[PDB]
Design a protein around this motif. Structure first.
Motif, PDB file in Angstrom:
ATOM      1  N   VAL A 100      60.210  70.241  69.697  1.00 29.29           N
ATOM      2  CA  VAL A 100      60.998  70.883  70.560  1.00 29.29           C
ATOM      3  C   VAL A 100      60.838  69.998  71.955  1.00 29.29           C
ATOM      4  O   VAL A 100      61.924  69.808  72.720  1.00 29.29           O
ATOM      5  CB  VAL A 100      60.594  72.380  70.847  1.00 29.29           C
ATOM      6  CG1 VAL A 100      60.661  72.999  72.403  1.00 29.29           C
ATOM      7  CG2 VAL A 100      61.247  73.306  69.831  1.00 29.29           C
ATOM      8  N   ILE A 101      59.714  69.822  72.327  1.00 26.50           N
ATOM      9  CA  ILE A 101      59.333  69.124  73.743  1.00 26.50           C
ATOM     10  C   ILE A 101      60.012  67.676  73.441  1.00 26.50           C
ATOM     11  O   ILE A 101      60.669  66.911  74.350  1.00 26.50           O
ATOM     12  CB  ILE A 101      58.128  69.124  74.387  1.00 26.50           C
ATOM     13  CG1 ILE A 101      56.819  68.641  73.537  1.00 26.50           C
ATOM     14  CG2 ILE A 101      57.738  70.431  75.123  1.00 26.50           C
ATOM     15  CD1 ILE A 101      56.938  67.099  73.269  1.00 26.50           C
TER      16      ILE A 101
ATOM     17  N   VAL B 290      62.967  66.936  71.773  1.00 25.45           N
ATOM     18  CA  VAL B 290      64.292  67.269  72.036  1.00 25.45           C
ATOM     19  C   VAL B 290      64.539  67.545  73.375  1.00 25.45           C
ATOM     20  O   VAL B 290      65.305  66.730  73.760  1.00 25.45           O
ATOM     21  CB  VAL B 290      64.696  68.661  71.200  1.00 25.45           C
ATOM     22  CG1 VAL B 290      66.048  69.048  71.532  1.00 25.45           C
ATOM     23  CG2 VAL B 290      64.744  68.433  69.579  1.00 25.45           C
ATOM     24  N   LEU B 291      63.690  68.108  74.244  1.00 24.64           N
ATOM     25  CA  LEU B 291      63.867  68.392  75.528  1.00 24.64           C
ATOM     26  C   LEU B 291      63.971  66.827  76.309  1.00 24.64           C
ATOM     27  O   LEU B 291      64.911  66.464  76.722  1.00 24.64           O
ATOM     28  CB  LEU B 291      62.618  69.431  76.095  1.00 24.64           C
ATOM     29  CG  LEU B 291      62.200  69.357  77.613  1.00 24.64           C
ATOM     30  CD1 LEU B 291      63.521  69.996  78.280  1.00 24.64           C
ATOM     31  CD2 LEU B 291      61.104  69.970  77.802  1.00 24.64           C
ATOM     32  N   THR B 292      62.931  66.034  76.125  1.00 30.35           N
ATOM     33  CA  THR B 292      62.686  64.764  76.498  1.00 30.35           C
ATOM     34  C   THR B 292      64.073  63.990  76.608  1.00 30.35           C
ATOM     35  O   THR B 292      64.547  63.624  77.433  1.00 30.35           O
ATOM     36  CB  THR B 292      61.448  63.964  76.313  1.00 30.35           C
ATOM     37  OG1 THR B 292      60.256  64.663  76.449  1.00 30.35           O
ATOM     38  CG2 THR B 292      61.560  62.763  76.991  1.00 30.35           C
TER      39      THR B 292
ATOM     40  N   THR C 238      67.148  64.917  75.556  1.00 28.46           N
ATOM     41  CA  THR C 238      68.319  65.454  76.393  1.00 28.46           C
ATOM     42  C   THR C 238      68.172  64.880  77.841  1.00 28.46           C
ATOM     43  O   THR C 238      69.070  64.404  78.564  1.00 28.46           O
ATOM     44  CB  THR C 238      68.384  66.879  76.263  1.00 28.46           C
ATOM     45  OG1 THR C 238      68.570  67.291  75.086  1.00 28.46           O
ATOM     46  CG2 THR C 238      69.900  67.447  76.776  1.00 28.46           C
ATOM     47  N   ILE C 239      67.082  65.227  78.468  1.00 26.17           N
ATOM     48  CA  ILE C 239      66.858  64.887  79.773  1.00 26.17           C
ATOM     49  C   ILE C 239      67.253  63.254  80.158  1.00 26.17           C
ATOM     50  O   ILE C 239      68.117  63.197  80.849  1.00 26.17           O
ATOM     51  CB  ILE C 239      65.284  65.204  80.115  1.00 26.17           C
ATOM     52  CG1 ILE C 239      65.184  66.636  80.531  1.00 26.17           C
ATOM     53  CG2 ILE C 239      65.052  64.257  81.384  1.00 26.17           C
ATOM     54  CD1 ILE C 239      63.937  67.021  81.083  1.00 26.17           C
ATOM     55  N   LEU C 240      66.582  62.454  79.060  1.00 29.00           N
ATOM     56  CA  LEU C 240      66.975  61.044  79.174  1.00 29.00           C
ATOM     57  C   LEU C 240      68.617  60.602  79.131  1.00 29.00           C
ATOM     58  O   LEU C 240      69.062  59.693  79.588  1.00 29.00           O
ATOM     59  CB  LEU C 240      66.018  60.291  78.352  1.00 29.00           C
ATOM     60  CG  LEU C 240      64.605  60.151  78.835  1.00 29.00           C
ATOM     61  CD1 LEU C 240      63.683  59.385  77.672  1.00 29.00           C
ATOM     62  CD2 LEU C 240      64.200  59.540  80.025  1.00 29.00           C
TER      63      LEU C 240
END
Ligand code: HAS
Ligand code: HEM
Ligand SMILES: CCCCCCCC/C=C\CCCCCCCC(=O)OC[C@H](O)CO
Ligand SMILES: CCCCCCCC/C=C\CCCCCCCC(=O)OC[C@H](O)CO
Ligand SMILES: CCCCCCCC/C=C\CCCCCCCC(=O)OC[C@H](O)CO
Ligand SMILES: CCCCCCCC/C=C\CCCCCCCC(=O)OC[C@H](O)CO
Ligand SMILES: CCCCCCCC/C=C\CCCCCCCC(=O)OC[C@H](O)CO
Ligand SMILES: CCCCCCCC/C=C\CCCCCCCC(=O)OC[C@H](O)CO
Ligand SMILES: CCCCCCCC/C=C\CCCCCCCC(=O)OC[C@H](O)CO
Ligand SMILES: CCCCCCCC/C=C\CCCCCCCC(=O)OC[C@H](O)CO
Ligand SMILES: CCCCCCCC/C=C\CCCCCCCC(=O)OC[C@H](O)CO
Ligand SMILES: CCCCCCCC/C=C\CCCCCCCC(=O)OC[C@H](O)CO
Ligand SMILES: CCCCCCCC/C=C\CCCCCCCC(=O)OC[C@H](O)CO
Ligand SMILES: CCCCCCCC/C=C\CCCCCCCC(=O)OC[C@H](O)CO
Ligand SMILES: CCCCCCCC/C=C\CCCCCCCC(=O)OC[C@H](O)CO
Ligand code: CUA
Ligand SMILES: [Cu+2]
Lengths: 554, 31, 167
Positions: free
Chosen positions: B8-9, B11-13, B15-17
């Motif tokens: 999950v984190i 995936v998070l990272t 998208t952010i980038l």
């Protein structure tokens, strides 16, 4: 009811909830029409037959923003963050004040409401001078917000009365959250309060001729960033303290939850120039200072991401799911109080990522005041915050009222939240995209239909969303009214305990809680960062007031 | 190890980038 | 035990994540840093407070005659005094040499407008009684739309201007 005699705050809380959800329904009726607009389809001729007091696109947009982002969010912050600490501590709020806060909110809503409807403050929810609305709006808004000041006192009184009865005990988790949440909001609200009393109100009364618009935005966006952490934290509270048990598990860490909240107390207010990146006569250095501090406030969220995800993975394994993804299946996707906040957290992934772009100073020139922005905040407030709020209907309505939720009711709620979630993601795509193509916000684009021909694809998405979200809104009004218009009552429902989660605890827990619990020390810190952040600029701008006459252009 | 939260984190990272770097690109293109 | 092992391994994973997180935010700040050091910086408004009388802007001074609001103020540098008003811009059009440093100076005599030049990073609020100042160099010749991106009343959605960039 002997239920309300024992427990009167149940009836006060419910008053808060309903007014908020009423506001939300009326608020969101303008929504699909604004999406249709963003898809190049003018539906306004239509809406005006149906609602003939609406004179412009921009009146609706004003009612939408005020009614959804300000009233519903505040009345919900009010219900949740008073009631839950009351029930954690098994202690009673001062009932006199609780009612008083409610009456303040209702009176202000209705005074504000009257010029909005009569078309005498088509100024939008940011109400930027020198656009000069009716004095009643300014006075409305003012009493509404100040209603929270009473709220704050109520919870600090609770805390205080619990601590005097328990010397040497640490603050319990929920009341901890609410304490720093209310003390933060107190710091954060002083901009707009200050804007209201020295500027808006006297000027709308015609007691002074002009307002300086640069001081107004400045004081405004003082409150303006942290009003969104005020919307968000009640939802976060639920997601940390209630969602675990509803998924099947436990919150994995009390210390890590607390640290989340404490960093919000510290960092939520001293950040507003991120709203003023393209403003003249504010120092480039102070803009950068604000941008870096805007990136830090993202850290509690990044942190919340890990704590909650680890929590759900927990519950899931304890429920039979194996492997990298099997845990996700095992969770209770039949239960609306679970699915809603979770699909909310999902959309917050792209929405938090847009949040950081906007934060980054120079990058802001790409997106500022384009469709990108409403695309960004619908994921944040219109889906996470709202989805969580609707979710809590499914345990909170029967715990304040005694009315059961049927199997059927439950199945409709599931449909509703799904469609809301899907409608929001769809509109995100559209608006993100239109914005990169330079399509502005706060614009009746449907009325200039050849102005944005390069955005015809992203426009298809906004027509779709507007339809999906119309249906979701309709099944929500019908849904919610079938509960609230139900004759059958089980008083043993109103008598159960709120579904708080158990916590996994660890040896490190103690020494850590005690730090964070030095509340006065942490509040003085946060007040300090406020004076430092805003202080040198306000003295500049106050030293050099250039107030200008007001205009009515609608 | 919380393999699940880590995914999950991840995936998070990502998208952010993609958001942040993709917009950095546009900035200098318009510059 | 399960739960006690869970928590220790959860927290050990959360410690690294937070550190990776810091690292990334620091790199973001560095990369912002660089933008501030380059010509891409001119689009940032000046910090100087430069105050006018919105009430006379149209009668007295470099805003009063739109057909003169272009001024060679450097070797390869031009100044343009722009009026944003309800509901349009002056001068219309703004004609400017390709390749010169353009320093825009936009004011408003009524309410707040936006000054957003499509295809560029020029995106500035325009407040009455204050001057917004932004620099830029057009690298391509052609017509560029100004779009008003601040709600300024009912005429908002038709508030458009034009820059013509000359070869
Ligand atoms: C509640 C409401 C809102 C939240 C929260 C919010 C978050 C942020 N925003 Fe934003 N925003 C801005 C930057 C941020 C940043 C840095 C954050 C951060 O707090 C966000 C950090 C978020 C994260 C780091 C995300 C955490 C991700 C999580 C928590 C998901 C975990 C997922 C799970 C667990 C699910 C997976 C598990 C399964 C089991 C499936 C900026 C820039 O400085 C502007 C100015 C734009 C302009 O140009 O004018 C702005 C504009 C707005 C406006 C418009 C004001 C106007 O009317 O003009 C509103 C209403 C708004 C709302 C909200 N915004 N924002
Ligand atoms: C059926 C659901 C909804 C739909 C279809 C919808 C649609 C829209 C659209 C398309 C806009 C952009 C209008 C513009 O910039 O000209 C907008 C603005 C806005 N919406 Fe929503 N919305 C919905 C629900 C919500 C909710 C739940 C919230 C808050 C919880 C909210 C808060 C806002 C705000 C604050 C603005 C911007 C106000 C302004 O620019 O002055 N909306 N809405
Ligand atoms: C208008 C101003 C009157 C303000 C309202 C005066 C009535 C207050 C009575 C009260 O306590 O009402 C709370 C609640 O309705 C109990 O069921
Ligand atoms: C609960 C909110 C109610 C607030 C009321 C304050 C209204 C402000 C009234 C204060 C008087 C203003 C004043 O003195 O204006 C004269 C000025 O000096 C001209 O130059
Ligand atoms: C509750 C009491 C409210 C005060 C009632 C005072 C009513 C205000 C009317 C006077 C007023 O503001 O008139 C418009 C003004 O002249 C141009 O801005
Ligand atoms: C937490 C504390 C924050 C500490 C990190 C910030 C770095 C310091 C100064 C940047 C100033 C940048 C000024 C650039 C403006 C120059 C310019 O281009 O003006 C036109
Ligand atoms: C734009 C479109 C974005 C939509 C994507 C959603 C992905 C979310 C996936 C999470 C839902 C999984 C469903 C699930 O686990 O179902 C279990 C089932 O109910 C019992 O066997
Ligand atoms: C494909 C291209 C066209 C775009 C889609 C159009 C929009 C909506 C379709 C309706 C989707 C409704 C899904 C509801 C799922 C649901 O409620 O499942 C509950 C389940 O028990 C576990 O969560
Ligand atoms: C989906 C995302 C589509 C984004 C399309 C926008 C095009 C863009 O950003 O182009 C960069 C630059 O402006 C060109 O000169
Ligand atoms: C399936 C759902 C939506 C279709 C996807 C949307 C993309 C369809 C584009 C159709 C369209 O209207 O394209 C604009 C243009 O005018 C035509 O050449
Ligand atoms: C089903 C999808 C819903 C989309 C219905 C409207 C499609 C649309 O946007 O049509 C515009 C078209 O390009 C103008 O001729
Ligand atoms: C208005 C109600 C009072 C709002 C002010 C709250 C701040 C306050 O009392 O701060 C002291 C703190 O509680 C020490 O630990
Ligand atoms: C599902 C919900 C979220 C949906 C939101 C859509 C926006 C997504 C990503 C931003 C990336 C920006 C798009 C531009 C990237 C283009 C690129 O990679 O390079 C272009 C070039 O460098 C310059 O012209
Ligand atoms: C494309 C960009 C790259 C993709 C980003 C990846 C996600 C980021 C960080 C991983 C989280 C930190 C994991 C490492 C810390 C774990 C650790 O220290 O483990 C020791 C423990 O005692 C034994 O389990
Ligand atoms: C374990 C690894 C540790 C150490 C590694 C950390 C990573 C370094 C990050 C960023 C470099 C900054 C790049 C600065 C150069 C920017 C130049 C650029 O992109 O120029 C494009 C533009 O067109 C020109 O005007
Ligand atoms: Cu000028 Cu909108
Ligand atoms: Cu903000």
């Amino acid at each position: 009811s002997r239920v309300y005699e024992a427990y009167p705050e149940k009836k006060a809380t419910l008053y808060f909830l309903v007014l908020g959800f009423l506001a939300l329904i009326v608020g969101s009726l303008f929504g699909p029409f604004q999406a249709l607009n963003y898809g190049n389809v003018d539906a306004y001729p239509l809406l005006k037959r149906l609602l003939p007091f609406v004179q412009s696109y921009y009146q609706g947009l004003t009612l939408h923003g005020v009614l959804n982002a300000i009233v519903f969010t505040q009345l919900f912050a009010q219900a949740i963050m008073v009631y839950l600490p009351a029930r954690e501590l098994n202690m009673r709020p001062n009932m006199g004040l609780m009612w008083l806060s409610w009456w303040m909110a209702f009176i202000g809503l209705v005074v504000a409401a009257l010029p909005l409807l009569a078309n005498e403050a088509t100024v939008l929810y940011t109400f930027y001078p020198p656009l000069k609305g009716h004095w009643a709006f300014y006075l409305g808004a003012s009493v509404f917000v100040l209603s929270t000041w009473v709220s704050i006192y109520i919870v600090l009184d609770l805390w205080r009365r619990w601590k005097a009865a328990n010397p040497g005990k640490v603050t319990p988790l929920v009341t901890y959250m609410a304490v720093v949440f209310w003390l933060m909001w107190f710091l954060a609200s002083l901009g707009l309060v200050l804007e209201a009393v020295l500027f808006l109100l006297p000027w709308s009364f015609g007691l002074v001729e002009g307002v300086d618009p640069l001081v107004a935005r400045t004081l405004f966006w003082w409150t303006g960033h942290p009003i969104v952490y005020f919307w968000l934290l009640p939802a976060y509270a639920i997601i940390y303290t209630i969602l675990p048990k509803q998924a099947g598990g436990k919150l994995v860490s009390d210390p890590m939850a607390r640290l989340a909240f404490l960093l919000f107390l510290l960092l939520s207010t001293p950040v507003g120039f991120h709203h003023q990146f393209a403003d003249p006569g504010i120092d480039p250095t102070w803009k950068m200072i604000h941008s870096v501090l805007t990136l830090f406030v993202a850290v509690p969220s990044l942190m919340t991401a890990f704590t909650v995800a680890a929590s759900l993975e927990f519950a899931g394994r304890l429920r039979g799911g194996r492997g990298l993804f099997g845990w996700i299946r095992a969770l209770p996707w039949d239960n609306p109080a679970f699915v809603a906040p979770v699909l909310g957290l999902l959309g917050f992934i792209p929405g938090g990522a847009g949040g950081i772009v906007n934060a980054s100073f120079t990058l802001d020139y790409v997106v500022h005041n384009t469709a990108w922005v409403p695309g960004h905040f619908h994921l944040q407030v219109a889906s996470l915050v709202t989805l969580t709020a609707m979710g809590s209907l499914y345990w909170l309505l029967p715990n304040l009222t005694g009315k059961p939720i049927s199997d059927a009711q439950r199945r409709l709620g599931l449909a509703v939240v799904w469609l809301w979630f899907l409608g929001m993601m769809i509109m995100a795509v559209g608006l993100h995209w239109a914005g990169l193509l330079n399509v502005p916000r706060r614009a009746y684009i449907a009325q200039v239909p050849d102005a944005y021909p390069h955005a015809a694809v992203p426009m298809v998405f906004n027509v779709l969303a507007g339809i999906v979200l119309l249906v979701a809104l309709l099944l929500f009004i019908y849904g919610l009214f079938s509960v609230l218009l139900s004759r059958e009552r089980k008083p043993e429902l109103a008598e159960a305990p709120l579904p708080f989660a158990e916590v996994i605890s660890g040896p490190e827990d103690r020494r850590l809680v005690l730090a964070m619990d030095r509340i006065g020390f942490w509040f003085a810190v946060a007040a300090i960062l406020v004076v430092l952040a805003y202080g040198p600029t306000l003295v500049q701008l106050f030293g050099h007031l250039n107030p200008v006459p007001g205009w009515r252009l609608w | 190890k919380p393999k699940g939260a880590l995914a999950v984190i991840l995936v998070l990272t990502l998208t952010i980038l993609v958001f942040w770097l993709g917009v950095y690109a546009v900035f200098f293109a318009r510059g | 035990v399960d739960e006690h092992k869970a928590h220790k391994a959860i927290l050990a994973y959360e410690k690294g994540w937070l550190a990776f997180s810091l690292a990334m935010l620091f790199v973001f700040i560095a990369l912002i840093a660089y933008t501030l050091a380059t010509h891409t910086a001119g689009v940032i408004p000046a910090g100087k407070l430069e105050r006018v009388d919105p009430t006379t802007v149209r009668q007295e001074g470099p805003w009063a005659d739109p057909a003169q609001a272009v001024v060679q103020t450097g070797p390869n540098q031009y100044t343009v005094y722009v009026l944003a008003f309800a509901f349009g811009y002056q001068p219309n059009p703004i004609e400017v040499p390709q390749g010169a440093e353009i320093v825009f100076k936009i004011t408003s005599p009524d309410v707040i407008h936006g000054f957003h030049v499509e295809g560029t990073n020029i995106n500035v609020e325009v407040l009455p009684g204050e001057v917004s100042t932004v620099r830029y160099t057009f690298k391509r010749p052609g017509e560029y739309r100004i779009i008003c991106n601040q709600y300024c009343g009912l005429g908002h959605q038709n508030m458009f201007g034009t820059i013509v960039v000359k070869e």
